[PDB]
């Protein structure tokens, strides 16, 4: 483009002398990335590139120090440094092409713009390879869920596919890969998951819970004549049971993030977060808070009233200092049903 | 593709060079030639060949990159099953003197001898699991309707009154079903027909026979699209798959105690009456060849034992032999499997099970002389490939005189298409064969077939695939995957057959003793790609292989099927896959 | 090196040569490369000297980066390509005339060293690794032998306010010893086993707190041998020896009596303390080696500085070997944290794996940040020495040799000689803390642990385990799915160990108190084979306090742990009180 000179070698002319050929195909890149001139279109459409001066000169990396860009030519890379850079050079010209460049003499310097097609088309991918092709170190690639050195150091957790349903892309793979490494586990991941997203805040958890209704639609403690059993099921008329309902409790003290976890703010990063990351259809978590007071109004209209279930923070007109007490509650992280129906159908007679 | 990257840089240098010979510099001196013309064989030929292998490997490297990471399934190792030869299809046999006599056929017999190619050899191929024969064989297959609504057909009274059917084990006689299956309803309905049989009754006159354990019939070897469902679905197939069709299974069919209630001479009926109070289609024909006593599936796999020229150096050896260097298997001949080398210098020496032995931190804890196996490509152009494989420590103390080393090498070939086999038997089983045996050749053969490599995610999405994680799932999270990757033989019905998916979703069951977290699932669509009653119902065992087997790694995982046959219809089918306990 | 430059030579020219030829047939009917002939000019073998020489070193930068790549995408889970430093026992004593409000006071001190070699001396971490309270001292304990198998300490002195001092915090002193493994382990065997311990009062200088109200007990291991794996199964944050070092997160018997002393008037304490069920064996010595107070072995790490470089370009590669660096040290550690004064930002510093996402999808409030190193080689006779680079969108283009920048780092210690020296010099650790201190080294320093994992065929096996299962099921994955962290010391004792026979899963139901049904599991392994080590009432007791600690494994689990050796007299099982508060 006109604007990789007018932007590089106009203003930046002052480290040219001691710069990288790694740093420098680099800023190019960078200097136009919203539709760049990728790097991989070299297959077929190398015509209408313009691309940076660096061929003909015959350079090893980080060895690209002189600066000469023109601009009547329509492309710039016009250079070939005599008496320098003969970068795998062994025997001199043909017998047949001396007679049509006549006689490796000034017309050589006409000559090297069709010599060197071929060190041009192989520079770029000689560069490409130490720094985006086996290199990155998912540092250098830096992509935004695009580049190919995350998907392949990505799928080693299974989510291929899986960004469906999710609000946000897969992002939280910095920090919990490796937790999301051991199977079955574990408790003390959710740990992590707090101090990640939002420091000043602790997490607690307990292992068992009292749960309770799931109501039997029969109530079974009809005392029965014809058929009945004992060994097991015991009880009155609805039962509790605490198998899998942990209980997680929150620890604040800067206000600002004390109005993050009332719904709306941070509350809908845990909750995508839990339902088809670490957790899916393992369990279901019920979550608390403990704060000073509260920042709480009231009966305002249509949506923003409720503190979770319950109100507060509207009242003590009393006295200056603190209180400590249980802030609300959360809802679960659950996905069930029924879906309606009977059958028709069965299995096989074997 | 090998001549996509030959055509990519062939249209790129023509532009190169029209954008530099038309107002860059060159064209002071380069005009000279390009205006008086010189398309040269001189010049064009070798400038373009130095660009084009420079332009092929690199390319093909850099962007594909068939990482060394991706071996690692190598030592989980179903995928031998990545060169799977031709669909050869069932075979037959005739009658041979059938009076008084007993059969019992080992498999290994070698078929086809005589079709002979173009630039294309015979190809001699084995079978599995052969058929202890029982000769009976009923010549005409007859639909007959009832006065009441129910069609019946043909008995079991053809070769009766010349043996001793006393001396013979009646046991199990399947039956594969016969090429009325290409009018593609009827082995859809005579398998499902026969979830709900009924008692038989066949008028002969001769008290000769008497059977139970009533013989379950089959018929799959039709498609093998939906065998690698069932492929990966018996994770404990590692020492079975070495062979690869597995019918030792023989695609589930049973048929119960089905006593024939016979009745005297003219009164008859054959009678599956749940299912056969819903009668056949009118536009569905009946075939007299429905014959089916003597099908047996055979697979190209061909072997041979080339002589022991052997060794001197390191593992640069990857086996080039004359028996396959000959000219006629050089253009088609391929190597498929290494085993049963190492028997040189003394009786031990570097057995070839080592290689696969090790998946371990313990490598130093392993006696001396061992062993190891990779592979390459081969051949560019076709398939072909090679194995270099080497020692482990032995090697290490550079000693090449080992030399009378044992082989055993199987292999298969490649073709053209537009071929139209001859059949014929190779050999025949001595002492057993009494008149010797023609054969028919069933079906039409298919090509061989083989995995998508070409795409990153199309390796690292099985990667996913052998955990149990299936938390939640979509329709498009189960459409593309990974249903497409054992859709190797993409037809144009199997793309019509797997986009008639249209909606996934979870709910969860929680009946309860002690607690029992558990769900459901549920899917099935439109009556149009897998809408006869059988593929319907016979694919539908298909999957339910693959969900009882990626169930739970904690016990609060359950699976149980409820769907949705047609936009109006209802079925389900399992019953509540307690597993014993994967951790 | 040169050989194999001309291996690719010959390979591509017959590659070129005949396969690209006439294994292409279709577009060779376009092409006919044999028949048609050389050209005239020396043009042939210039260009096959040409086009496949730039086919050479591409291809060896080809066989680089892999090497590099696998090495740094398999530390994600893992970390260790690291090392190990060395570490050994320092105990410490204050003086008996300070007594006087005797409180230890663990804020900010020293260590101790000694001058090695080529005039090399030590610099350890210091410790801020608390004490509660100091000890007495320690009295002449003498092993006395009972009837009942018993074997008694003493401890006392006073000289001081110790009533109203030892008030404020004796009540969880979990205070304890260490020795040699045959003779310290065998009282941890029955530091679970204690009886009743009737007399229990330590003697001589009772005489001035007079109350006996709090108890405190206690218990110790060498945290150097089996527990590095239990200081592996952790997350992705947290240092290998500063997190667990410093912390008492172990599973210790800490069993505590309650039975009160009988004694005679005038006695400020008797001298029984040690009832058990079982015998003191015999040939067993006896030593006053039990401690009163010692702390940890503690390791080296220097506290390193250097000087801000900053140049437009320095973020590729710059690799600075700092000025103290200079002067013989040879070695140094991770890059801890980078601040200072830049144009707009005062400090705008996060490291790599933990970006609050402006570059990815958070987007909001926590801008461009990069940090990160790598421990590249090529080093004139070492193993690594690299220097860190990172790179984004901050302001070089205007700023090319101003940036924020202020960097700490630790060190260690590599070249060394074999010896093992006790620390004698840098006796300045006392000048904060008014109370003068004892210097002890107990033990012989250790090596620094480097030698990892050296070939890449192991790490097959580091990449197995996430396709693979929990190393729970059949013990072919628990002889495997063992870390070689036992084995990079090499123990033949602890490679003796790794002999386990094959691992059966259960699973129970239990009632709680109440009422409750509470999930659980039962693994059962088994010995079978004899020659464990030496005494399997020591080892195999002090195995399964390892193992069962590295059994954590779902949210709802009740603990499963029961050990069976052979049919040879016992079958120990291993359980705890489980609550639904947290587990015991």
């Given at each position: 483009s006109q604007s990789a000179p007018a932007r590089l070698i106009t203003r930046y002319r002052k480290q040219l002398p001691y710069i990288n050929f790694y740093r420098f195909c680099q800023l190019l890149e960078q200097s136009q990335p919203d539709q760049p001139p990728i790097g991989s279109g070299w297959q077929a459409r190398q015509e209408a590139v313009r691309f940076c001066p660096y061929p003909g000169m015959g350079f090893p990396a980080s060895e690209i120090k002189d600066a000469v860009i023109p601009e009547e030519s329509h492309l710039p890379p016009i250079v070939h440094v005599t008496f320098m850079g003969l970068y795998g050079v062994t025997s001199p010209l043909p017998a047949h092409y001396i007679s049509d460049i006549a006689q490796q003499r000034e017309g050589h310097e006409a000559a090297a713009d069709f010599l060197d097609i071929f060190s041009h088309r192989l520079i770029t991918q000689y560069y490409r390879i130490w720094r985006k092709y086996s290199y990155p170190a998912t540092f250098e690639a830096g992509g935004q869920d695009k580049t190919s050195q995350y998907l392949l150091g990505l799928a080693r957790l299974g989510i291929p596919g899986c960004a469906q349903n999710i609000a946000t892309p897969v992002s939280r793979f910095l920090a919990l890969l490796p937790l999301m490494l051991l199977p079955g586990r574990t408790a003390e991941g959710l740990t992590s998951l707090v101090t990640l997203l939002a420091p000043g805040t602790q997490a607690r958890v307990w292992h068992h819970d009292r749960r309770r209704i799931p109501l039997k639609t029969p109530l079974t403690m009809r005392v029965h004549h014809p058929v009945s059993l004992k060994s097991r099921p015991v009880m009155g008329d609805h039962a509790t049971d605490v198998n899998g309902q942990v209980l997680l409790q929150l620890s604040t003290q800067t206000g600002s993030e004390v109005q993050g976890w009332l719904p709306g703010g941070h509350l809908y990063s845990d909750l995508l977060a839990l339902l088809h990351v670490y957790l899916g259809s393992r369990l279901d978590v019920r979550l608390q808070l403990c704060v000073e007071r509260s920042l709480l109004p009231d009966a305002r209209l249509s949506c923003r009233p409720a503190a979770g279930s319950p109100q507060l923070g509207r009242t003590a007109v009393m006295r200056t200092q603190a209180k400590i007490a249980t802030s609300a509650a959360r809802v679960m992280t659950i996905s069930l049903g029924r879906y309606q129906r009977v059958q028709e159908h069965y299995q096989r007679k074997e | 593709l090998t001549l996509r990257y030959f055509d990519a840089e062939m249209r790129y240098l023509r532009e190169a060079g029209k954008a530099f010979a038309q107002a860059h510099p060159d064209r002071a001196a380069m005009l000279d030639l390009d205006k008086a013309g010189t398309p040269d064989p001189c010049v064009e030929r070798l400038f373009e060949g130095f660009a084009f292998s420079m332009g092929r490997l690199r390319q093909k490297i850099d962007d594909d990159l068939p990482e060394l990471t991706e071996s690692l399934v190598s030592m989980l190792w179903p995928h031998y099953l990545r060169t799977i030869p031709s669909l050869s299809v069932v075979a037959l046999t005739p009658r041979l003197s059938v009076m008084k006599m007993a059969e019992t056929v080992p498999a290994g017999l070698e078929v086809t001898s005589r079709p002979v190619g173009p630039g294309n050899t015979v190809c001699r191929y084995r079978t599995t699991r052969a058929i202890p024969l029982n000769p009976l064989a009923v010549e005409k297959v007859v639909m007959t309707t009832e006065p009441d609504g129910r069609s019946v057909l043909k008995i079991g009274f053809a070769c009766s009154e010349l043996a001793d059917w006393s001396q013979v084990d009646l046991h199990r006689l399947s039956l594969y079903l016969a090429a009325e299956a290409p009018v593609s309803s009827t082995l859809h309905l005579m398998m499902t027909k026969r979830l709900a049989a009924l008692y038989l009754r066949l008028p002969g006159n001769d008290e000769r026979i008497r059977i139970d354990g009533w013989f379950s019939p089959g018929g799959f070897a039709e498609e093998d699209r939906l065998w690698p469902k069932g492929d990966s679905a018996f994770s404990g197939y590692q020492l079975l798959l070495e062979y690869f069709t597995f019918r030792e299974k023989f695609m589930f069919v049973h048929l119960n105690g089905?006593?024939?209630v016979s009745l005297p001479a003219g009164i008859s009926g054959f009678d599956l009456e749940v299912v056969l109070s819903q009668p056949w289609p009118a536009d569905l024909p009946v075939t007299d060849d429905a014959l089916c006593l003597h099908c047996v599936p055979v697979i190209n796999l061909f072997t041979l034992e080339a002589d022991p020229l052997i060794i001197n150096g390191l593992e640069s050896e990857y086996l080039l032999r004359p028996k396959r260097l000959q000219d006629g298997y050089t253009e088609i001949y391929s190597v498929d499997a290494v085993t049963?080398?190492?028997?040189?210098?003394?009786?031990?020496?570097?057995?070839?099970?080592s290689f696969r032995h090790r998946g371990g931190m313990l490598r130093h804890d392993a006696p001396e002389r061992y062993y190891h196996t990779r592979v390459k490509r081969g051949?560019?152009?076709?398939y072909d490939t090679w194995l270099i494989l080497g020692g482990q420590r032995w090697e290490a103390d550079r000693m090449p005189e080992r030399e009378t080393l044992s082989l055993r090498i199987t292999g298969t070939n490649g073709q053209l298409p537009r071929r139209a086999l001859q059949s014929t038997l190779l050999d025949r089983c001595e002492q057993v064969l009494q008149a010797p045996v023609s054969v028919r050749n069933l079906c039409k053969p298919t090509l061989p077939v083989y995995p998508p490599t070409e795409d990153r995610f199309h390796w690292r999405v099985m990667s996913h695939l052998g955990t149990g994680f299936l938390n939640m799932l979509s329709s498009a999270e189960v459409l593309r995957g990974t249903l497409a990757l054992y859709?190797?033989?993409?037809?144009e019905l199997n793309h019509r057959r797997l986009d008639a998916i249209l909606a996934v979703q979870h709910h969860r069951i929680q009946r309860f003793e002690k607690g029992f977290l558990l769900r459901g699932l549920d899917v099935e669509v439109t009556l149009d790609g897998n809408g006869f009653a059988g593929e319907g119902d016979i694919h539908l065992f298909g999957e339910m292989l693959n969900r009882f087997l990626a169930l739970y790694a904690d016990m609060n995982q359950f699976n149980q099927l409820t769907l949705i046959v047609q936009p109006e219809g209802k079925c389900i089918r399992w019953k509540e896959n307690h597993n014993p306990r994967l951790p």
């Open positions: - | 089905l006593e024939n049963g080398s190492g028997r040189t210098g003394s009786a031990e020496y570097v057995p070839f099970t051949v560019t152009g076709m859709n190797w033989r993409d037809d």
